[PDB]
Amino acid sequence: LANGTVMSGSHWGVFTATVENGRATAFTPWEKDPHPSPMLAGVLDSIYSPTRIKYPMVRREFLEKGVNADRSTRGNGDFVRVSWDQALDLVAAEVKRVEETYGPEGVFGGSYGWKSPGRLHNCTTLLRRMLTLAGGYVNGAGDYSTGAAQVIMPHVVGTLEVYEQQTAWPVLAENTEVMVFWAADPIKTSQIGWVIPEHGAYPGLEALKAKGTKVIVIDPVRTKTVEFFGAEHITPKPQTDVAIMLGMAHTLVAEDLYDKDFIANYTSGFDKFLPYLDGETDSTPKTAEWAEGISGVPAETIKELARLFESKRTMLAAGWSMQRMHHGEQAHWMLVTLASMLGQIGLPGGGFGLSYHYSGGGTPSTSGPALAGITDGGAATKGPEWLAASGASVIPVARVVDMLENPGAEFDFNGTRSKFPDVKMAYWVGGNPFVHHQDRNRMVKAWEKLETFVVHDFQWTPTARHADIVLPATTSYERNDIETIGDYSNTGILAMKKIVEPLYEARSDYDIFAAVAERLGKGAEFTEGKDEMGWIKSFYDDAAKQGKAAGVQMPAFDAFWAEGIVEFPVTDGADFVRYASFREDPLLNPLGTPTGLIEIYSKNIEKMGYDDCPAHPTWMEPLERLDGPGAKYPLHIAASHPFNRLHSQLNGTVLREGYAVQGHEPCLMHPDDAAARGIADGDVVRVHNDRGQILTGVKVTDAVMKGVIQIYEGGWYDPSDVTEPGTLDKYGDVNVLSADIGTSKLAQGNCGQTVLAEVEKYTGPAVTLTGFVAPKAAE
Numbered sequence: 001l002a003n004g005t006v007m008s009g010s011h012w013g014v015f016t017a018t019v020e021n022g023r024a025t026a027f028t029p030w031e032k033d034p035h036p037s038p039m040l041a042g043v044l045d046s047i048y049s050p051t052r053i054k055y056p057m058v059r060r061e062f063l064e065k066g067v068n069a070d071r072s073t074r075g076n077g078d079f080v081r082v083s084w085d086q087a088l089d090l091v092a093a094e095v096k097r098v099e100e101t102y103g104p105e106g107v108f109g110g111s112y113g114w115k116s117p118g119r120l121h122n123c124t125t126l127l128r129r130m131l132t133l134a135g136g137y138v139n140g141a142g143d144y145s146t147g148a149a150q151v152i153m154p155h156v157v158g159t160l161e162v163y164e165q166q167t168a169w170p171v172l173a174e175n176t177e178v179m180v181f182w183a184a185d186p187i188k189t190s191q192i193g194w195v196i197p198e199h200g201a202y203p204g205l206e207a208l209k210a211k212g213t214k215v216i217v218i219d220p221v222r223t224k225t226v227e228f229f230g231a232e233h234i235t236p237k238p239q240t241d242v243a244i245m246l247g248m249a250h251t252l253v254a255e256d257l258y259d260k261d262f263i264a265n266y267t268s269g270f271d272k273f274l275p276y277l278d279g280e281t282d283s284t285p286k287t288a289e290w291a292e293g294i295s296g297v298p299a300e301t302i303k304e305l306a307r308l309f310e311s312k313r314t315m316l317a318a319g320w321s322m323q324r325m326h327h328g329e330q331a332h333w334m335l336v337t338l339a340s341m342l343g344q345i346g347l348p349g350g351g352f353g354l355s356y357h358y359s360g361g362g363t364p365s366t367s368g369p370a371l372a373g374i375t376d377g378g379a380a381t382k383g384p385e386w387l388a389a390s391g392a393s394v395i396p397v398a399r400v401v402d403m404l405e406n407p408g409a410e411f412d413f414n415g416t417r418s419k420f421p422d423v424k425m426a427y428w429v430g431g432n433p434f435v436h437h438q439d440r441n442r443m444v445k446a447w448e449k450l451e452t453f454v455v456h457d458f459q460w461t462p463t464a465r466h467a468d469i470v471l472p473a474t475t476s477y478e479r480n481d482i483e484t485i486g487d488y489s490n491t492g493i494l495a496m497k498k499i500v501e502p503l504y505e506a507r508s509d510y511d512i513f514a515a516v517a518e519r520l521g522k523g524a525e526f527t528e529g530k531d532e533m534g535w536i537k538s539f540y541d542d543a544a545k546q547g548k549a550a551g552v553q554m555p556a557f558d559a560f561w562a563e564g565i566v567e568f569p570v571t572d573g574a575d576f577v578r579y580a581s582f583r584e585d586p587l588l589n590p591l592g593t594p595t596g597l598i599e600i601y602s603k604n605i606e607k608m609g610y611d612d613c614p615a616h617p618t619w620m621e622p623l624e625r626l627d628g629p630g631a632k633y634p635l636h637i638a639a640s641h642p643f644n645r646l647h648s649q650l651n652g653t654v655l656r657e658g659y660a661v662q663g664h665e666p667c668l669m670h671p672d673d674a675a676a677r678g679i680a681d682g683d684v685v686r687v688h689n690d691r692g693q694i695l696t697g698v699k700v701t702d703a704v705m706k707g708v709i710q711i712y713e714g715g716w717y718d719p720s721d722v723t724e725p726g727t728l729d730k731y732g733d734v735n736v737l738s739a740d741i742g743t744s745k746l747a748q749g750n751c752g753q754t755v756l757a758e759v760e761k762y763t764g765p766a767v768t769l770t771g772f773v774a775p776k777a778a779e
């Protein structure tokens, strides 16, 4: 049996595995990783945990009745174990039947999800590769992270902005005087990467603290970011950040401090925004005192913050939670507008940055080449013949349930009108929509419209428990692959080597789709005559020929594989200043906006005439907010990203023991809010509102501000009874309480953090958790 060490990587970093008699027994972090993540131990455990999917399973009702099956029982665990040949035939038959009967509009292939890194074993692209050969599919656009901000930014600054390289960390160390983390917890969220992370922000944060720079955190929760710096902490009522920004802007106008030259030469439309700010249009001057009444943040604090930002070199590093809410578009639009008034855009250490908390943004980029990977083939096809009627071929990701509920209906998106297709089948790989999507009870009922639902995963998630057909996938650690280290830095290329043999009857997504493509008569088209190592060698060889051309030397494929990693050099990467060239000469280097300047007022958005997205940053009442006029529930749920999970990943591993409270997902509550309900620390509680009800376990702390509770997203939904409408979730999936609505007509983003609820001590009948053990028939 195999004994030795093997280096690989993941979403949590680079590591070395210890293998003993063919079993991975420890994962040790890479020696050059400046800040390893404590979740590595959970990654290892994820391979062997009790929720690992062993065999291909078919839903008993679906097996016996096909499309006439009762669809209300999806999720009850009544599965039938089948052979791979049986399951593959069924999957291929169903894909073919739906394509022939309904056309490409009948198959939803968006399959949103964080999957695993790797250029070959990219399950979502592999699924689209197969669906392409099958006749077509409906896809998803945008994402659940910057759903509103990625659509508003291009109308304001010209590009996406959120997924672009930031002013380098070192530039910040020598020039920044005031660092503001606005709705950002970089310490918590910098642990993972889309591709292998280099954890480059930790060293960057460490240099700011060593320099003694003043740090301000604006967040309702006292996070590790606050604690790490001993920062001045401002706690607004969730969803009122725009009110505070207007209050600050108003102060800068009233005391005549803002930068008129900056505004005059680099922006457009300020004069159309001024009247609103002064109350000329609505009779409501947006003062610091007016902001105080809405946000709860003292008027004088708001004025002192405004003045400090204007007199010191300030960097506004904003997170994404505050645009994952109703009217999300205004949050970063107003932030840029405030940034414009301060006049530091394009100066070393000043301006704003939207990716300092995500995937190493700000870590100096190397001069290394770009790495490519398997494609879905669409760019060299001549896909479906599509047209309105049948409907749109692309929907904004968060409108999947609206689509199911309203086939043929029209919807708005960024100035256009399209129709919802009539989807009959959904195929999901590498995602967990039964945890990640909003308003669980609404979505549980809307799923009944799908005849067939196919899922691949290696863990028994809520999504997999609800499938008609479940196929067991392998982890990254049971195969070979290649991937980039550093989403922005491009630190190097890593060989992701196989650690152990596939467990049970698990198969890679690639092999599964290969076999399904074979049954549709398209085997060679899918595989291209290459095997695993042939694909990986061609990605590397292409990068090397690109490297060569640019003067970067790279070893031959087998030399690279023997080493396991290539590292690229940093040349001018550490001196990068975002927007510097625009500041230096705006006429020669203008933005990609109609006017070529920062658009505070948008004529383009004006012509769309959307009620929920005015032509300039505006304060608007959200669906529900803490202490809002007529608010029905009293507590705001900060349903943010989990510290010891990657979304739902690693919930069914040994890490859960360290944070669960009586077996349930933890809930942070302030002592005063606990006292009022006669709630003691460690008690099981019922959290509920009009959309659903869930059980969590309380942790009493003053880390959360009064009026706010913290229940992280990602908990595995564990319904008491799937056939009972609004059944109680026994574990703690925060998305059973959120609403499923668009941010506005412009972006249609998710409003996953626009949630209010009530909490009461749980006194009902004892409950048995069943989400962390495999379905009985799957053992």
Ligand SMILES: NC1=NC(=O)C2=N[C@H]3C(S)=C(SO)[C@@H](COP(=O)(O)OP(=O)(O)OC[C@H]4O[C@@H](n5cnc6c(=O)[nH]c(N)nc65)[C@H](O)[C@@H]4O)O[C@H]3NC2=N1
Pocket: 112, 113, 114, 115, 116, 121, 123, 143, 144, 145, 146, 324, 429, 430, 431, 432, 433, 435, 436, 437, 456, 457, 458, 459, 461, 473, 474, 475, 476, 509, 639, 640, 641, 646, 647, 648, 649, 713, 714, 734, 735, 738, 752, 753
């Ligand atoms: N109320 C909410 N608040 C929020 O803040 C919140 N966040 C969003 C955002 S920001 C995201 S990402 O943009 C989504 C993430 O949902 P996702 O389904 O990507 O989550 P995961 O728990 O990472 O599911 C991944 C899934 O894939 C499996 N897997 C891994 N490797 C592969 C593979 O190679 N083969 C297969 N077939 N499967 C793979 C994992 O095991 C895992 O189950 O959440 C939003 N919701 C929010 N709500």
Ligand SMILES: NC1=NC(=O)C2=N[C@H]3C(S)=C(S)[C@@H](COP(=O)(O)OP(=O)(O)OC[C@H]4O[C@@H](n5cnc6c(=O)[nH]c(N)nc65)[C@H](O)[C@@H]4O)O[C@H]3NC2=N1
Pocket: 144, 145, 146, 182, 183, 184, 185, 188, 189, 190, 191, 192, 218, 219, 220, 221, 223, 236, 237, 238, 239, 240, 241, 318, 319, 320, 321, 322, 324, 357, 358, 638, 639, 640, 641, 642, 643, 644, 645, 646, 647, 753
């Ligand atoms: N460890 C960890 N696990 C993860 O699951 C995770 N996921 C990754 C992904 S996919 C992304 S897209 C990003 C998300 O990065 P993002 O900035 O969207 O993260 P959140 O955890 O949702 O919110 C961050 C902070 O915003 C605060 N906040 C909430 N609402 C308000 C409010 O209205 N006003 C203010 N001022 N602040 C508020 C929260 O309290 C929290 O500390 O993180 C990434 N990093 C990840 N880290």
Ligand SMILES: [Mo+6]
Pocket: 143, 144, 145
């Ligand atoms: Mo995200």
Ligand SMILES: [O]
Pocket: 143, 144, 145
């Ligand atoms: O994401």
